[model samples]
Structure formats: structure tokens, C-alpha cells
Target: SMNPPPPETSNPNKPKRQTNQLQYLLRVVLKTLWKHQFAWPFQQPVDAVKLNLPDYYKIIKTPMDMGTIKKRLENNYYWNAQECIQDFNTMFTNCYIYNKPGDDIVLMAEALEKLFLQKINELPTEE
Candidate 1:
């Protein structure tokens, strides 16, 4: 919960620094979701604060752990998507924003989009 973020920069290709800044931001979204502020169950290991190395990577990148999250994220929607974002916004300001959270709001939106897609995909075809 306390790893320093990739250096803030206006341009891309920070590749030489040896961290995927975008992916780290994605995990930032993941880390806050783990807190269950919106009642979502897709929690990750605390050590996923950094995720892990590639080839044999860690959660959200590796097979098993990503699948682990998929199971929890799918087929459960007690509220609509915008409200979900609103809920996260409230949670973010009240609990998470002061932590110097990541700036990738897009990834957070996609995470909710994916969750909604899951619920829709699982919906029955027949009446």
C-alpha cells in the first residue's frame, strides 16, 4: 500500500526506468478496490502493491490470479455503473485520494465497464 509511484512525466517511453507506469497505475486501481468500499469482492494479495516480475508475473498479469479476480468480478452488480463510479469517487476522496493514488481514471472506468460486461454476458438469453 506504500510503494512510490513512477515518476510523473509529461511524455511516455519511461521504459528505461524499468517499470510499466501504466500497469502500476492499473494496480493502483486494483489496490483501492481491494478495500471493499463499493462492496466489490475482487481483492488482491497485499504484496500485489507492486505486483511482480514478468514471464512469471504476479496478480492481474499472471494467469491464476487474474482468473481469481475474474471469478469475483463477474455476475455481481448490486448497483448501476455510474453509481459505481460515484461510489468509488466518494470512497476515493474520503479514504483513498490522500494516499497519492494513481491518475489513471480511465483504467478505473474500464474496470467497472468490464464488471458490467460480465453481468450482462451472464444474463440469460431467454425470458
Candidate 2:
């Protein structure tokens, strides 16, 4: 029984190294979950969560790839039908609730609100 070595530091100058490490771990977990979607042994009930109108629309419209988003923002590059659909699918699958049944719409909305609120709150207050 030996302890594992620490993960490689993303940046020595960054103060929130632990937060960055946690984010990296989350990405791996999400990817594993996504990859194992078809291998479940039991028949799981589909979760029907009703997302609020605005949040639903935003998740359905945002792009997952930063490169695509940057290109669009830089010179008014329009997303083609395929790109738009792909981005929508990516964002929807990654951000929306999927494991529980019933209208978790309010929960999803609140989570998003809290996330943004926390980010804003974490910002330095002084100019």
C-alpha cells in the first residue's frame, strides 16, 4: 500500500493548482462516463428533465470547441448546419441532466445560476 505520486502541476505560478487538478479529474470522469454509455448491464430508466426555456436554449446553442467559437467571434464566421448541430449536441449532452427522472428543470437552472454567481463572487471586488 503506497501513496500515488502527485499529478503534474499545470502552472507553477498559478495559486489555484488544486482547483485546476480537480477540473482535470472531472474531465476524465466525464469522458469515462460518456464512453461507457452503451455498456451498462442493467436497463436504466431514462431521465426526463425539463430545462427552463432560456437555459435550454442557451445549452442548445453554445459551441463546445473554443476554436470554432473564436473563429465565429473574430470575423462573423457563420457556423454551417453541421457545425451548429454538432456544437448543440456536444453542449446539450455535457451540460444537461441525464441520470434522474422527473422535472429537474429547476435544479438545473439553479445549478447554472449558482455557478455563474460563484464565478462572479470569486472575482476581485476592487478595480
Candidate 3:
């Protein structure tokens, strides 16, 4: 299954808290982003050579994408939702760094960022 279920709970301290609620919401947001119309460029890692971006790696210290973020989320790499949120920001930040403000790619990133931020606002804060 490409969209495998999240892993079993690794943190035993909060057994009754049902902390997976946040994880479930994160998964929903990720899946929605994946299906978004402007999600093409962000679905995979940047291929600097193929895209003719000679300084991409040099300029963007942390390369991020939806694929890696999804894998990490499924593997329980993020201790909390904020880390996952940061990865999304990093993905858009890289886009902003490489593309001009008026570029189509930047505009696409902006659209996705707006959607992501909107969904993220619904996430539970205290949990």
C-alpha cells in the first residue's frame, strides 16, 4: 500500500492521551496537499542537474519535498506536528529562495502555502 498506515505507538508515556489525533490530522493535510493542482513541483526532491539549477543545492541548505515529508510522517520521524509543519515551511522556503517572487513556481508555492496554512490552523494546539 502506497499510503501505509502510521506506525504503532512508540511513546508509552501517554498511553491514554490518544496522541495519534494530531498525526491523523497531519496525514489528512498531507494527502490533501498531494492531490492539490499546484502540487506537482513539490511532490519530489529537486533535481538540480536535470532542471539546470546549478546553485540549487548550494543556495538551499535544506532541500525538502512532500514525498520525504510523507515518508517521515509515516515512519514516525516527527515527535510532534510542529516538526512536520516546519518541513512544509522549509519546502516553500526553498521555492522562494530559488524562484523570483513573480515566477510561476513561486506563485504555485504561495497557493499551496495558503492552503496548508489554512488546514494547519485547524490543528489542535494543546495536544
Candidate 4:
């Protein structure tokens, strides 16, 4: 699972995650869903990304791979480009990119988390 990127920091001693495409996508997903409430899911201080195993698992799974979509762009791999596009399209659909809420416009963490957790749980379990 991915945590939101730490806000840009100045303290040299603190560990901070630099932004990349992965983090950017995560940020987009998180910010769009969480509505910038960046402090709630983390520790008491909430200065940077902090998530417990459950929280982590809530975001990722045992065999989860956020990199596969990107890899499809480079070397030839499992599925063809058409298939990969469908995969990403499904992913974007899951993000509710088209499901803007009603008049009030409220999106809940549980909604996104539940969807993802259900998706992760459906993955093939290895012995």
C-alpha cells in the first residue's frame, strides 16, 4: 500500500519520500479521495508519511504490484499494450474518476479503502 508523500520538508534529519511518478499517482489518488486531510491516518505528529501494517495492507497487498503498468510501456511482458490499457482503464474507473458525488460531494476514506481492500483480497493466494 502507498502512503501519501510527505509534505516538502526542510529538516535534514527527518526521512522524507521524494516525489516520483509512483508517489505522484499515489498523491493524486489519496488527495482526490481524502480531500487533503493528510494528518488523520498517520501518527500523532503526522509530519510525514506514517502508516502501520494494517494501514499499509489497506493500501497494498502481499503480491501487489503498482509497477506493472509502467513496465508494460518499456520491455514486452505479460499482457499486450491493449490489455495493459484496459488494466489502467479499470484502475482509473476504480478511482471513481467519473463518479463525482451528489450535490454535497462527499467522498469517504472507507469507500476507497473498502474497494481497494476487496480488490487486493481477490488476488491469488500462494501456499
- Among these predictions, the greatest lDDT belongs to 3
Looking at model 2, the pairs that clash are none
- C-alpha TM-score for every candidate: 0.21, 0.22, 0.80, 0.26
Q: lDDT value for candidate 3?
A: 0.75
Which pairs of residues clash in candidate 1, taking residues 3 or more apart in a chain or in different chains?
none
* Global lDDT of each candidate: 0.33, 0.32, 0.75, 0.34
Which candidate number maximizes TM-score? 3
> Which has the better TM-score: candidate 2, or candidate 4?
4
Summarize candidate 1's per-residue lDDT along 1-127 as a digit string, tens digits: 4433321222333222212322322344334444434324223222334444232222222122222332222322212333223333433332232223554433453465455444434433322
lDDT of 4 by residue, 1-127 (tens): 4544432213345433322333333434323433434213211112113424334333332221224333332323322223433444444343243235541212442354555455434433322
Clashing pairs in 3: none
Q: After superposition, how far is residue 89 of candidate 4 from its true place, in Å?
A: 0.8
CA shift at 95, candidate 1, in angstroms? Answer: 22
Kindly report the root-mean-square deviation of model 2 from the true structure over all alpha carbons: 16.7
Candidate 3 residue-wise lDDT at 19: 49
Report model 4's TM-score to 2 decimal places.
Answer: 0.26
Better of 2 and 3 by TM-score: 3
Supply the global lDDT for candidate 4: 0.34
Q: Mind giving the per-residue lDDT tens digits that candidate 2 earns over 43-108? A: 121121332233433333332432332232233333232332343245335444432333453344
